[PDB]
Amino acid sequence: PTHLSVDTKFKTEGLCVDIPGIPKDMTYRRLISMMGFKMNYQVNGYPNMFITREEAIRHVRAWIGFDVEGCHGTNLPLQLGFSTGVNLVAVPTPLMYKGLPWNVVRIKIVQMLSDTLKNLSDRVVFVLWAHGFELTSMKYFVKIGPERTCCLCDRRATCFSTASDTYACWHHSIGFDYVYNPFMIDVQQWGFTGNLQSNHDLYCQVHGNAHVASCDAIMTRCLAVHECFVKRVDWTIEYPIIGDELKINAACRKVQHMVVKAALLADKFPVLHDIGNPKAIKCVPQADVEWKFYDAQPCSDKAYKIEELFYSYATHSDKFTDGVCLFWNCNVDRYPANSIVCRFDTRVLSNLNLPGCDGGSLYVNKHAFHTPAFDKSAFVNLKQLPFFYYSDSPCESHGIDYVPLKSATCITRCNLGGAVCRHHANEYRLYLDAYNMMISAGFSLWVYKQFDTYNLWNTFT
Numbered sequence: 061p062t063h064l065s066v067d068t069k070f071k072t073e074g075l076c077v078d079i080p081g082i083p084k085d086m087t088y089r090r091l092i093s094m095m096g097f098k099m100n101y102q103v104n105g106y107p108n109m110f111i112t113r114e115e116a117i118r119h120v121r122a123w124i125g126f127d128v129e130g131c132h133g134t135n136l137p138l139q140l141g142f143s144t145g146v147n148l149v150a151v152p153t154p155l156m157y158k159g160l161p162w163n164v165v166r167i168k169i170v171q172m173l174s175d176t177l178k179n180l181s182d183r184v185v186f187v188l189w190a191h192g193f194e195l196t197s198m199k200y201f202v203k204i205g206p207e208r209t210c211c212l213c214d215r216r217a218t219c220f221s222t223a224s225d226t227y228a229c230w231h232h233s234i235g236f237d238y239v240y241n242p243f244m245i246d247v248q249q250w251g252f253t254g255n256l257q258s259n260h261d262l263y264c265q266v267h268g269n270a271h272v273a274s275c276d277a278i279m280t281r282c283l284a285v286h287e288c289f290v291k292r293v294d295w296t297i298e299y300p301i302i303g304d305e306l307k308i309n310a311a312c313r314k315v316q317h318m319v320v321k322a323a324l325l326a327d328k329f330p331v332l333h334d335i336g337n338p339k340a341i342k343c344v345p346q347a348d349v350e351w352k353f354y355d356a357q358p359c360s361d362k363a364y365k366i367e368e369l370f371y372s373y374a375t376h377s378d379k380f381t382d383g384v385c386l387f388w389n390c391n392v393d394r395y396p397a398n399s400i401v402c403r404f405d406t407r408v409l410s411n412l413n414l415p416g417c418d419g420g421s422l423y424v425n426k427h428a429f430h431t432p433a434f435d436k437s438a439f440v441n442l443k444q445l446p447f448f449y450y451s452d453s454p455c456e457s458h459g460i461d462y463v464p465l466k467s468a469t470c471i472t473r474c475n476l477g478g479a480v481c482r483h484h485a486n487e488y489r490l491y492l493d494a495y496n497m498m499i500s501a502g503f504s505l506w507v508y509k510q511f512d513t514y515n516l517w518n519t520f521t
């Protein structure tokens with residue numbers, strides 16, 4: 061059970077309005093044959109055009125919703141819609157394009173998928189709510205065959221060119237006209253009652269139905285993400301490194317240690333309530349503070365209600381008002397005023413952050429985390445945490461050329477003494493790099509209103 065057997069049954073009830081008379085008994089093998097594709101008994105890495113739900117989840121970065129609506133089926137123009145917002149009209153002679161023949165439409169498809177996916181995935185997975193026309197239109201822009209490599213690099217081939225008779229990956233496909241060996245999954249096969257809009261609207265109010273193919277393509281991919289990442293969550297699935305994952309995670313651990321350590325030194329809290337990851341470790345192991353941990357896995361649907369995080373049933377909760385609360389990526393509706401908070405901003409544009417369900421986003425870095433929509437009102441009791449670098453380490457070099465550092469936010473004994481030493485300047489610039497990496501990845505930092513770095517200077521006496 062590695063791939064989806066071509067002899068698996070495909071429910072054809074969703075297909076019978078575009079294709080009336082379709083057999084109720086249908087296998088993937090017969091469907092693929094009906095679509096105009098010949099697998100010809102080939103054991104070359106492409107056993108089926110269609111993939112399992114499990115394989116689709118492993119390749120979420122490759123998901124592109126796809127819908128086809130009949131504008132007028134051999135003699136009529138089709139509107140091709142993609143979860144990128146693109147609508148192309150193909151004539152058989154929110155971005156809406158005018159009627160053009162397939163030979164030019166297919167060039168645009170390859171360009172669009174290539175620009176969208178080159179930094180996300182080695183493939184495309186068309187996410188469908190299959191009614192018939194999307195499957196029968198594939199033959200006009202898709203070619204299949206054995207698994208191949210790019211003509212310019214070692215990556216797998218995702219495109220084919222009839223002009224040059226060559227294959228390319230998403231990075232080297234300029235001028236290519238066919239999508240080569242794509243994958244697809246039909247959301248309707250999962251067992252739903254009612255149409256696409258009725259199932260999508262149950263979970264999401266951000267995607268409306270403006271009655272174009274791209275709206276359906278968006279809704280289809282949204283509903284798929286809800287089913288695979290919101291209601292059902294899998295933290296055993298690892299995802300490849302496609303960008304700054306390692307640097308971002310390392311920056312996150314540096315910022316956390318810095319901010320929490322300085323909050324403990326500035327306001328000397330006697331107790332810290334660490335609410336979040338059940339596998340969390342003390343980010344400041346040498347701190348005096350009474351460290352108390354509370355387990356809450358990342359919320360993937362709605363933000364946790366703060367009232368429910370403290371709901372102790374028939375017994376008393378701990379006194380959250382005593383000391384400080386640390387919410388490191390533990391997303392709540394409204395933070396207590398005595399908090400240190402790291403909250404991922406779902407609106408961030410990046411190769412790690414994919415569009416999600418109901419305003420939320422699917423953040424993919426080692427694991428997939430569907431995150432609830434960033435909401436500014438969650439931080440009404442707090443303020444934005446300013447950048448600062450703090451260090452009590454000795455002014456000792458141990459060792460990359462140099463320019464003297466002048467900064468009001470380098471909180472060290474040397475800067476108090478009038479001149480930042482080389483070590484603390486090197487460490488300040490590295491910390492500032494890590495800090496900017498974390499902010500630009502989408503993370504935002506918030507703190508209790510009494511926080512003041514001026515209180516850190518007297519820790520050097």
Ligand SMILES: COc1ccc(C)cc1NC(=O)Nn1cnnc1
Pocket residue numbers: 333335354368369370371372373375376377378379380381
């Ligand atoms: C669902 O939460 C609980 C369940 C049972 C019990 C006994 C306690 C809690 N909570 C709790 O004490 N949270 N806390 C965090 N910072 N101050 C208080």
Ligand SMILES: [Zn+2]
Pocket residue numbers: 210211212213214215228229230231232
């Ligand atoms: Zn290539």
Ligand SMILES: [Zn+2]
Pocket residue numbers: 260264265266267278279282283416417418
């Ligand atoms: Zn939606």
Ligand SMILES: [Zn+2]
Pocket residue numbers: 454455456472473474475480481482483484
């Ligand atoms: Zn120094």
